């Protein structure tokens, strides 16, 4: 099993929701002889998903035709704003947020809203942070509807992130 | 020989009222030399000795501070010398009244003097003005033993004036120096900066006439109004969307529901919420609640609140309200209207004050019930240790009082009765509706007991149709689901009430000088009074504030002004030195003056564009 071990690693990754390209997986190892999925995940968390990820999302997820998304899947956050609340004022209290998140699998970008209160995320959550979606996510008019039950913050940071290359 | 005791009040009307009280109506009055001021004489007892009492008055401030001679002209430069070099002297505030000569004359055969000037700091400053004229001509004192006394009082009533006489104290000279210091600071800095600009701009612009001025307090006050203007002009409205749904009750009523999420600023997400709700025909009750809550009665009335209400509700400018209140105080209808205190002293006879209003048709029944049931304790506020809250001290009708005077008096009385009444108790009810995935709520208030809101109907809880009674699990037919598209709105220009609050927060215009400064910037045409008593900056007002800020932000920001006034108050408490505060402050502003003149280009350019 010279690189068979690398293959089973990919399968384990996908079961956890991580969809990486074959080239990306090699990049996250430290040696070609000793693949460790734990090390790969740790490195990937701090890597731009546009560099190492493989497309999993449907090309037309934003068009509205797609109504559901089945997990597990790991995504990267590109940008967050208060969509419930005005631009200049921002935070002040008599609103409920209501965050909007632009997310990507490295190939397809999509837009999510905070449908129910997620204490785990905020306006200050750094771009590059990875999240794992699990269960069935409803998509209405092209927007992913997220809540505490279908969304898990995995962490990670990506410095000086550029929204659009 | 029987000793003669001179007593001096602040105004002719005050002197007469005080004398009627102390003499128990045994009064003999004759005209003074000036025609305006009268003299009130009677016999009585002083310091366990038979004496003659001689009560008269001045007419407000006896003196105003001005330079000695040549520094009074506008053309006479250098304006910069007015900071340190120019000598000062007191001049008669109103030469036609010949006030100084009159005081010396009535003061000449008198043996003792008792000061009955108003008990704010202004009245205290005039005390030493009066003493300066009368003391050199008084009968010599043998011990010498105390021959000079000062009465302290807050209202022109039999109880308060007689009690004042029984516990005479002394004038506060430390506090007196602070007023002198305040007078000198505003004049020097004001005239230096103003006269400089009037000459600099003299005949410079076609559309520019003498209307230009600067003031160490008036300028930060204008700054607030212009600050609001700048935020308004640069405001950029954003479109947002609010989902609302209507449901039909069993009694055939349209219930309006409020979106739990309140609003959204994304067009597409707005459409998303509407799509997933617009087809739903039923709204499900998810929760209900009833909580008894209380809307508290107001804090005792302070000066700041009076001016705000007089402006917002009665349409009276701050200066207009103050002069009206002082006249009411003068006639003994209210206590002294210059106080920051909002807490009634334990000793204060609330019931005594309340009984005079027990017969006026508008609030007779409310007052009568409270005296039988027993008065409630007013909310505990802050006790600044100056005077009681502004409270009615005597009954009045709309027949006795004139238009403006009555309207202000009516409010002050109604406000007082509320502070001693019971709180308003009401029911806050809510129903939570589920429509599709979305949550909606409807709220309603039902008054249980009006409490103070009976005598103050404008603070009443609004009358709403009672909410339908229902249970968790019930369902109502959805009558309509629409999505309204709106735009966030810019602020309006500062109301007089808002300006007052700003000045109070930042600690400028203390000792009730706030209405003076506000009236000042209006008279100088730096702002205009628009509908709703809004303060709209004039062309000149805007350029000046912008000009001052570019050169030195500290000229407009209340920061500097706030600290000097805090220093002056410390002088008043004897915890700071009169001369040291003067020297330090004047040094600071002389340095700022020279920098201002050097950077004058910052002001001239805006003037060119505008004019
Ligand atoms: Mg006064």
Author numbering:
A (entry chain B): -3 to 161
B (entry chain A): 0 to 208, 210 to 611
Paper passage:
Topoisomerase III (TOP3) is a member of the type IA topoisomerase family, which functions mainly in relaxing the supercoiled DNA and in resolving recombination intermediates during meiosis and DNA repair. TOP3β is an atypical topoisomerase that can recognize both DNA and RNA as the substrates12132223242526. Eukaryotic TOP3α and β are unique in that they interact with their specific auxiliary factors, RMI1 and TDRD3, respectively, and coexist with them in the cell. We determined the crystal structures of human TOP3β TOPO domain, TDRD3 DUF1767 and OB domains (DUF–OB) and their complex at 3.44 Å, 1.62 Å and 3.6 Å resolutions, respectively.
Overall, the TOP3β–TDRD3 structure is similar to the TOP3α–RMI1 structure. Binding of TDRD3 did not affect the spatial arrangement of domains I, III and IV. The interaction between TOP3β and TDRD3 occurs between domain II of TOP3β and the OB-fold domain of TDRD3, consistent with our finding that the TDRD3 OB-fold domain is sufficient for binding to TOP3β. In addition, a hydrogen bond is formed between TDRD3 Arg96 and TOP3β Asp266. The insertion loop of TDRD3 interacts with the loop connecting β10 and α7 of TOP3β. In the N-terminal region of the insertion loop, Val79, Ala80, Ala81 and Pro82 of TDRD3 form a hydrophobic surface to interact with Val264, Phe265 and Ile269 of TOP3β. Furthermore, in the C-terminal region of the insertion loop, Ala90, Ala91, Pro92 and Met94 of TDRD3 also form a hydrophobic surface to interact with Val262, Val264, Ile269 and Phe273 of TOP3β.
